Amino acid sequence: SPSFTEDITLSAVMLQEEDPGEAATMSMYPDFLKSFLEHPSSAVFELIEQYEATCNTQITLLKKIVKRVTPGQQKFSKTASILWLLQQEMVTWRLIAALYRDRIQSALEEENMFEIAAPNASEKTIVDKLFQRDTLVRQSQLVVDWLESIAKDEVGDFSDNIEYYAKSVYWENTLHTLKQRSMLSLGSSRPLVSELDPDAPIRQKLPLDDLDREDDIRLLKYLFTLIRAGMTDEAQRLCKRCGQAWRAATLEGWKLYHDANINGGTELQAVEGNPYRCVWKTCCWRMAEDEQFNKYERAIYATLSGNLKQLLPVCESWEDTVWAHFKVMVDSLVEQEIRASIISFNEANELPREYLEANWTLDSVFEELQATDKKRVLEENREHYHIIQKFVILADVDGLMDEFSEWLSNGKNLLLGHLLRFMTHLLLFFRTLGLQAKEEVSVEVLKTYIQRLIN
Amino acid sequence: EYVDALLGKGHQYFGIQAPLSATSQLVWFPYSAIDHLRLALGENENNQHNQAILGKLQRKMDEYFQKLKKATDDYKKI
Amino acid sequence: TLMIDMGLFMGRSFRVGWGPNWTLVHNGDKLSERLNAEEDRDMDTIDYGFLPKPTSAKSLTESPFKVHVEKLSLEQKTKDLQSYLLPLEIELKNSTVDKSGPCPHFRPNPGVTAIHDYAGWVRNFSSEAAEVEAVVKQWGLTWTLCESLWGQLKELEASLDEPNEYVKNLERRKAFSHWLAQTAQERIEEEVSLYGPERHIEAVFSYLTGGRISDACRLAQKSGDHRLSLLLSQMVGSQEVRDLITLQLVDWNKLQVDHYIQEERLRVFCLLSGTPVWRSSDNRSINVCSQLDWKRTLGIHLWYMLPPTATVAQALHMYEQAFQEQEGGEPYACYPLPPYLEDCGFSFGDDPSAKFISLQRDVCVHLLKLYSERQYDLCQLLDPSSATPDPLDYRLSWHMWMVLQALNYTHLSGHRQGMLHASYAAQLENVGLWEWAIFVLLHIQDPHVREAAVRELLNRHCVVHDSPESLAKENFLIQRLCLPAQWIHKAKAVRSRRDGDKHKEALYLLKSHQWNQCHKLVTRHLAADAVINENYRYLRGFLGELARPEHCKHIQDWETAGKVYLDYISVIEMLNQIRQDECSGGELEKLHTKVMSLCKWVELIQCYSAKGRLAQSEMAKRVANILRVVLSLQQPPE
Amino acid sequence: SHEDMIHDAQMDYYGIRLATCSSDRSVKIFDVKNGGQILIADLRGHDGPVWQVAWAHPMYGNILASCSYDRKVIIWKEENGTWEKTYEYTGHDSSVNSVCWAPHDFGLVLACGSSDGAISILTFTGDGPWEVKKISNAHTIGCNAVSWAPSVIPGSLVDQPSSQKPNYIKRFVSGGCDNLVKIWREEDGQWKEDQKLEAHSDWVRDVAWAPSIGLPTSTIASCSQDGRVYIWTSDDAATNCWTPKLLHKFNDVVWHVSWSITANILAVSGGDNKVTLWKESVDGQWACISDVNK
Amino acid sequence: ISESGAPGRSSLDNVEMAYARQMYMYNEKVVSGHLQPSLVDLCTEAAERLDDKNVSDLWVMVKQMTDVPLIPASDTLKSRCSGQMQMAFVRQALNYLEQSYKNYTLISVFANLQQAQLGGVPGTYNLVRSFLNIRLPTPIPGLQDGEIEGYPVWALIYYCMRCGDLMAAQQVVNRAQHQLGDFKNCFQEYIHNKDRRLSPTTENKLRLHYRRAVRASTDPYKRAVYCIIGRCDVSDNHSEVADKTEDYLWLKLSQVCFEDEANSSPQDRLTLPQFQKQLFEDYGESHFAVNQQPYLYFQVLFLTAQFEAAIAFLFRLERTRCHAVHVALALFELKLLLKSTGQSAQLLSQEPGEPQGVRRLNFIRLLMLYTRKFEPTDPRE
């Protein structure tokens, strides 16, 4: 509709304070009820699709209303807070839909049967066989892919924003200084370099040009933002555009061959990877041990290795922290079950006996998350949305109902109309799927919902 | 000898490396040493060699000030 | 000493600056403040410093250099301690001393019933103390004026009978008259002691301004009888010769008459009636007093000038039109100057246009204007001098400002309150007070900033070498006042870490109860020190205090570092209990269980230094001994 | 002792140690007890005349920094009453001048101000290595002085006295000899152009920020080489408005301008042998109460 | 937000208190019957007496701009319909912008003192020369003919034009005898003619010379001076886009005239709505980084005849709605601000055919919100 476009175009330049947030909150309820009555609990996929569509629509509306002026007043501050809470509610709804899909897929294969245990070439087959033996690593990699998709969606139009300042020529100042030194014997009265390669100064242990170092740091920031989102095409595109494809060429050694070719007519797909992943991860462990470079390479080496001692300060956000923890534990379990059952003579990952004779589960994740000694994580583990996500992931009932009772005793000093509507819809979906809660909390939820409705 | 070396270039033989590469060429060394030297020279003024040394030092200081002004002008011309 | 002219030279030769605890580190001596020869040279602090500076005698061909570190502490406080403590100790109980949310916020309480108490205390002090200065008299008269203004005006007296509006106005007028008489009686007594039975009209010129009772005795002795003086002493209606001279002075100002010679022998009428002042450009000198003391001037103005039907605002407006230059010519009266000791202002008879440059305004006029209406300018008014020649000591000024803020009559300007609180805290920390600065600073609204400020103040004041007086002060702060003990515990822990008392710093850190710092400190020193010095009681106490589930669930590495010590202590205690109670299979089973459960974390527990290696060897030999014991005990002896 | 000239002389936060940095090729730290003095530390490791100095808080680490006329930055750490080596940097366009740490509300970030044409900021993170932030093309002739600015000042953001915790980001000012004054704010993860101003065409000595503990007004008093002084005041929200106003000008060589520890008294030292100690009165204006001789 | 009415006796702002006291004195004088002077001077003296300096100088500027000999209109509609008062206000705004640039030069001189690279010297020409030596004493590339005491004549002429010192410009022209070409007489005529009358043929020749040769020199000051003299285009930018839009606005106002004067032709003049849109969109808030200095934005909005836009901008700020209402009631006393009905719409309303900046202020809605944002306040206010 052009009305919204013209309204935001006029509000971005006008000098007034209009808050259509109340109108948006009053208009989102009838549309949500219409979508609910149009898509029942049967077609859950189409229901959640229409829900995500309408939710992205109102999120764009609210973000335009917010960005149309500087959020300095209390009204626009609370509007931005409501927008962030809506983004969090939608990401929790996405997590809930993913967990429901995983539970539906696992309900048809809860019971399995084991009979084949002889190993073969290429560890990818053993990994695929063990994937059906335990669902823990299954939901672990599912949450990993979900976080990767979250990062990809949060990156946004960065691929197009790069084109507004992407360079093409590099080492210009170094080449000019080398030319001056070669043609006039002057212009390099400093620890100069020998070759024009990205590894020559890092090998000779003598740097040059602080501006070149800052540009390389910015390019590494861009590479990290592109890789964290789970992208490689745009990464190699930027590499070919600039000239620093050495990082992309190096970040391709921890793979494995796909042994599936049985004839000549089949395409050659078993060319990516190398059987030296053991020595590769050993060198990565040594690098993480003697880490003394930049934060980005330190974090990438920590993620590629799995040293928790240096990963504790490497983890920037809670998502990265839980991703690193899940990856470390699943890698430890997989490598242990593969080595101790076949061959264990060369420890690829330097894990002592205290880590070798310990079967990691799922509660230990929440244990260390609550035991995080950092004040930031301690404060983040006591709010609302973080604990909601934790309870949704853990699928608990006792602690969930206890925290809901504490919330009801505290009052309406945290929940709102949209929050109560989302909670009622989640409870209805859970009751339609399986199990239930308590009659007291059920009637309390119902009375609070109808009170908010009549308000 | 120090003033002569600074006016010329013979600072490597004394220990001083490259001068302070600043935009405005001015006096940066502490003048307290020169003031104490002038006071010690003026303490005993019973012979003519002290007056001759004082005159030579004044002439060298004037020449150094002229050279410093010329260098400052050449630097500001950039 | 270098003093010749220079041309161009960068760098510097001497630098000054500031330093913590409110100190100044400056070059040169202190000739601008001190003038006597008894000056401490090369001082690092106040009162006796003496820094080794052998360059004083080595001069001629060398310039001397000396730096002095000092602290701002002017004047001298000897017996003023109680005089400054009594009003502060009264205001401390008058105001609220409770918390309000996270940061302790103090709320002001309206207390107009303390002005008369302060006045009575000042009167009693001046009575039982012969060394009363002029500042005490100024404070007393200002408190009396404030009591006559906003204080109790003797209302609801004699059963349930209150005066009317006109009666209350007359009572206010007579109270102001009594205050003016009490302020001018000192000057009247000085003039009486100076001269009495000598000159005639030259003395009557001032006797008319005086005229009370002690002076009325001399008036009667100089005139003839006392019945006329006793009637002339009373005001409001009682007017005989006073009214007769007023009738002549009324026509004197209406006519165009000037002065001749000796303006104090023939101008007897100039004292009473006094019409609005109107001057052209000649020589005119009439109205009240004619260049005397402003106190008795305003007294006569309120007594025998305007009729009693006029109000204080009308009298103030008349006096303003009198000593103002907007009358049409040149004034010739006097302006009420702020009395710090004995008339301590700037000139007499100056309009506000000529006063606003730098001349200090009156305080009584400002108080009357504030009582009238608060819609007048107050940003550039209110002199910082609290009825004293020195701008220091903001006692009665802060009291009046807090009373006005509690009664809601000031304006939105927090900068003045902030600077006043800062100056009061500086003065209190200079004279040697802590709780008073704390409770005068807790009045303003400031969360984390004032929290850190009071934290630093407590860390600088309360240390580990405290006296019984400091302990009693802390006990009073905890009991009668509202102050969290965790801040004091953290300050004591910081002070102990800055010293080295291991047991004291450990106790203070455990009382403060932190996370990372406490955990690393205990796991790095406490277990080893307890094992070394056989501090089993303290170790068990600390373990029982830290074994709460919340701490273990919030902090990391605890279940791998301190759990070993907890299990070892429990095993030792159960083994001692078993050895005391002979046979106990129910306890021996749990003992063996915990022992074989602990026999696994030896790979987690590692070394770090020589003390770590020694502790590891001790733990290993103890574990081996206990394992051999339990292995010998597991086998049945039957 | 100190037979030669004495530059700066700072004291510990408690009043025990006295660090006097002079050009006598010796840094002696005595003790303060019973009004006497006893030598307790003798540090020496510079190559030229030592200039400024700055202390720190013991809760974040007893660390001292000393600058000298040798393009060398020297840093010591205190352990068991003995100062040893920490971080030693060398090599610049000119000699280092100003040196100071950020307030306790931020951390232990050191600022290096010198007429080198660039800005090198040292950041102390963790318990070992440090970080360097380089800002080039910011000064034509070079820097001069750097004065930190805490975030606990209500004069910069009108949201502190309302149970709201403000942001703890790095903010300071700079007034080099490039005929331009500038403000630096840690935004967009780095440093760039924030707010520049032109008020002179020569050299500017130093600056002093007001560390107000309860005054909701942020002021900065500057001092130049030709006795020029600027009083930039601010009392707004979010974005401030620095007013290049004047007060008491001079014609000699005004050197240092220093605020009190709680923003109470201003001390100005130049070539007049008089340190005017100003103070804010109750009428919202300035007044000088005490003086001293140099 | 604003200084709302506190319930009974409490604590208000000193500015609002002094303004209410002055209004009380004005009402007392009205009741008495004697002719009152002007409340603008009383507000100015109150702002000067108060400790606040920025808003005091702002109100001083507003008073000096409103004290122009203009006829008091009735409403904003009548003001925008009348054409003579519009160009008169534009000329007065240009003159006051020149005076403000002169005052800024004086302030820069006072800041630079005297012994600092040739400080300020008494006299207009000497002050302009000192400002030029402080800004750029070195010879700028692109010099023609000679110089005056080794100073750039083109930069000196540009500074004199920007300051408005026509007598100093005449002195500079008289001093530059052999240091310039054969355009000294043209410069003298352009300075002496307030309506800019320096022969249409000579103006066309200068415009042709500027369009032919003076189009790529390294002297921005000389280029701008020649452009101003020849009256070419509507906007000529060289190096003024650097947080200093005052010179650009002055050049635009000097090159654009509403009435056809000497050497007037299409593609050499613009309209007031054009500048209004340029300052509202390209030079608006959160566009040209002007939110950190709202005083300059308010000043340029008041100069470009955007009273409603300036009022809205002052109302959008924090702790400034009080001053917005104060200047609104001042304009109402001076008989301005067109009345408009409406109690639920916004404050800035317009009709088809109205340009941006000059809108219909909803006085009814303003009074409604003013009465709704208030509590049982004091009887004086």
Side-chain angles (χ1 to χ4, degrees), chain E residues 9-112:
Chain E
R9 294 299 175 105
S10 294
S11 304
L12 294 165
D13 258 4
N14 46 359
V15 168
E16 324 298 307
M17 167 266 294
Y19 289 0
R21 197 183 70 254
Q22 285 183 345
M23 204 82 225
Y24 203 74
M25 265 87 79
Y26 206 98
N27 299 347
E28 283 183 86
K29 208 70 177 293
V30 162
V31 169
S32 298
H34 192 268
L35 310 164
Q36 300 89 228
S38 70
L39 202 132
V40 185
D41 304 319
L42 302 174
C43 172
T44 309
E45 82 101 18
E48 287 280 345
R49 171 178 53 234
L50 285 161
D51 279 348
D52 289 331
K53 295 310 197 288
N54 249 342
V55 290
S56 301
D57 298 342
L58 198 73
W59 184 246
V60 161
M61 256 85 87
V62 169
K63 165 204 164 157
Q64 287 310 115
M65 185 57 213
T66 321
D67 279 338
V68 287
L70 288 185
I71 52 170
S74 295
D75 277 322
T76 316
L77 168 67
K78 204 185 191 165
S79 308
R80 77 180 78 110
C81 279
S82 181
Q84 171 58 234
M85 72 101 67
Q86 279 304 305
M87 60 107 66
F89 177 76
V90 163
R91 290 174 159 161
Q92 292 310 290
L94 169 67
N95 299 335
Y96 200 41
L97 180 56
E98 276 170 300
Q99 290 323 292
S100 291
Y101 193 87
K102 181 58 193 178
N103 295 335
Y104 292 154
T105 298
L106 288 171
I107 289 165
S108 172
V109 158
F110 305 153
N112 276 266

Side-chain angles (χ1 to χ4, degrees), chain D residues 30-250:
Chain D
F30 314 94
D31 289 313
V32 177
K33 50 216 196 314
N34 314 117
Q37 35 90 27
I38 285 190
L39 187 46
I40 212 53
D42 194 13
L43 266 80
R44 193 244 185 270
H46 318 78
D47 278 343
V50 192
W51 272 330
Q52 316 309 120
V53 86
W55 280 78
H57 211 77
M59 264 279 105
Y60 299 90
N62 215 350
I63 306 162
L64 276 179
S66 280
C67 280
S68 174
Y69 189 77
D70 39 25
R71 316 178 174 170
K72 173 180 44 178
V73 197
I74 305 177
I75 288 99
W76 317 83
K77 57 165 83 73
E78 186 260 338
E79 273 89 7
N80 313 113
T82 311
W83 304 80
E84 61 250 25
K85 192 253 216 185
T86 311
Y87 181 72
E88 304 292 325
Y89 193 70
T90 173
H92 278 113
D93 193 18
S94 299
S95 291
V96 280
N97 309 141
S98 310
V99 44
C100 54
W101 273 284
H104 325 297
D105 190 32
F106 297 149
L108 264 193
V109 169
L110 193 69
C112 171
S114 51
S115 289
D116 302 354
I119 288 100
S120 176
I121 296 307
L122 258 296
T123 298
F124 163 66
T125 53
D127 304 308
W130 307 265
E131 276 81 50
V132 277
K133 316 294 184 315
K134 215 72 201 79
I135 295 103
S136 178
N137 290 320
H139 284 84
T140 297
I141 320 293
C143 179
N144 280 150
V146 165
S147 170
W148 274 107
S151 63
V152 288
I153 314 297
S156 181
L157 310 154
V158 197
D159 77 313
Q160 192 266 311
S162 295
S163 182
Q164 295 172 277
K165 303 291 183 289
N167 57 87
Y168 293 160
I169 332 172
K170 328 286 122 161
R171 281 108 74 191
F172 61 94
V173 308
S174 295
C177 40
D178 60 336
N179 317 329
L180 292 165
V181 87
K182 212 184 167 292
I183 326 289
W184 260 271
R185 147 86 155 90
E186 185 162 280
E187 95 250 12
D188 296 332
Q190 50 149 112
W191 304 87
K192 50 163 290 299
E193 168 59 82
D194 189 19
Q195 198 267 329
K196 69 178 179 66
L197 198 138
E198 36 264 20
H200 41 89
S201 196
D202 40 355
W203 295 358
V204 161
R205 279 259 61 81
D206 303 295
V207 278
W209 167 282
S212 283
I213 210 59
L215 261 301
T217 288
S218 144
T219 212
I220 293 120
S222 75
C223 42
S224 310
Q225 267 282 111
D226 292 322
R228 311 191 303 283
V229 56
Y230 311 119
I231 315 293
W232 293 293
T233 63
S234 84
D235 201 352
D236 298 331
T239 68
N240 296 345
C241 299
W242 311 116
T243 77
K245 293 296 183 288
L246 330 168
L247 214 56
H248 43 283
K249 287 290 189 168
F250 298 96

Side-chain angles (χ1 to χ4, degrees), chain C residues 356 370 372-380 405 407-413 416, chain E residues 3 8-14 16-18 20-21 24 49-51 378 380-381:
Chain C
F356 204 28
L370 281 172
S372 73
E373 277 182 84
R374 61 175 288 276
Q375 218 69 249
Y376 300 88
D377 294 343
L378 302 174
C379 195
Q380 323 302 128
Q405 284 180 80
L407 287 165
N408 298 115
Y409 280 103
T410 40
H411 274 286
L412 190 59
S413 186
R416 274 82 184 168
Chain E
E3 282 299 286
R9 294 299 175 105
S10 294
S11 304
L12 294 165
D13 258 4
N14 46 359
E16 324 298 307
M17 167 266 294
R21 197 183 70 254
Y24 203 74
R49 171 178 53 234
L50 285 161
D51 279 348
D378 288 328
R380 193 140 174 170
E381 36 216 66

Side-chain angles (χ1 to χ4, degrees), chain C residues 12 18 23 27 29 446 497, chain D residues 10-11 58 160 235 269 293:
Chain C
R12 212 178 164 185
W18 277 83
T23 53
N27 309 115
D29 293 331
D446 204 357
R497 196 180 67 90
Chain D
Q10 217 73 38
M11 63 183 284
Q160 192 266 311
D235 201 352
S269 176
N293 194 45

Side-chain angles (χ1 to χ4, degrees), chain C residues 564 567-568 593-602 619 623:
Chain C
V564 180
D567 194 13
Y568 172 72
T593 314
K594 280 193 277 294
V595 160
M596 71 180 168
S597 312
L598 182 130
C599 279
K600 190 197 184 313
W601 287 352
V602 200
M619 195 265 287
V623 156

Side-chain angles (χ1 to χ4, degrees), chain A residues 12-13 15-18 70, chain E residues 280 285-286 316 321 346-347:
Chain A
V13 205
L15 280 161
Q16 298 290 106
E17 275 166 321
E18 275 204 80
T70 65
Chain E
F280 182 60
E285 48 96 20
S286 299
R316 288 278 79 75
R321 308 183 185 195
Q346 296 313 110
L347 186 63

Side-chain angles (χ1 to χ4, degrees), chain A residues 229-281:
Chain A
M231 226 77 195
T232 312
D233 288 328
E234 274 82 2
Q236 69 233 9
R237 252 180 285 206
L238 184 136
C239 284
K240 290 175 67 174
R241 160 72 185 197
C242 289
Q244 310 98 31
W246 68 306
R247 279 262 79 87
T250 303
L251 257 299
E252 214 179 7
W254 44 274
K255 317 292 174 51
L256 193 60
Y257 293 113
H258 192 280
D259 292 10
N261 293 126
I262 54 178
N263 51 340
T266 308
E267 280 291 326
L268 299 178
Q269 73 255 357
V271 295
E272 296 317 297
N274 46 72
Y276 289 113
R277 69 263 181 192
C278 311
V279 310
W280 200 93
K281 77 173 63 65

